[PDB]
Structure formats: C-alpha cells, structure tokens
Amino acid sequence: IEILSKKPAGKVVVEEVVNIMGKDVIIGTVESGMIGVGFKVKGPSGIGGIVRIERNREKVEFAIAGDRIGISIEGKIGKVKKGDVLEIYQT
Numbered sequence: 001i002e003i004l005s006k007k008p009a010g011k012v013v014v015e016e017v018v019n020i021m022g023k024d025v026i027i028g029t030v031e032s033g034m035i036g037v038g039f040k041v042k043g044p045s046g047i048g049g050i051v052r053i054e055r056n057r058e059k060v061e062f063a064i065a066g067d068r069i070g071i072s073i074e075g076k077i078g079k080v081k082k083g084d085v086l087e088i089y090q091t
Helices: none
Strands: 010-020 023-036 040-042 047-055 058-060 062-064 068-074 085-089
Touching (some): 010 068, 023 047, 023 085, 047 062
Antiparallel strands (some): 010 023, 010 085, 023 062, 023 068, 040 047, 040 085, 047 058
C-alpha cells in the first residue's frame, strides 16, 4: 500500500517480465543491496509486495547483489519493461 523507508534496500534490473494468471513474474538480477520476501516494490504506477523469490530454480527467502532471480509480485505496480531498474524497500 505505501513505502515507509527513505532509501531502497536493494535494486533489481529487469531482464524479462511475464504476466501469468493475473500475476507479474519478473526475471532480473539484483543490482545492489538485497531483497527479501515481503519487501516492497516501487513500480511506475503502484507498490507491490514480493511474495516469492526463486534462484537457480529454488525457493529462497532473500537474494543479494549479483543474484539472478525470478520474483512474484503482489499488487498491480504498472507497466514494467525489460531494462527497468526496480527499487525495493525493506518497509
């Protein structure tokens, strides 16, 4: 619903975005910092929640810089494109 932190916990460069059964699945690489399940994604139009992270086809609770991951987001965040860098917030 809203972002409470001043600075991002991490950033993700989007490699591919797919919508499947009404949900955005984002493939990308953590560019800086770290992201975890439950963190907030600042999209162009909305704020989403990280629901799941997979790395090397394995569920993980968090990922750090250099990790290439898939992410499921909760909430409509607007149009995300390959090449966008999404800011991710602890709260």
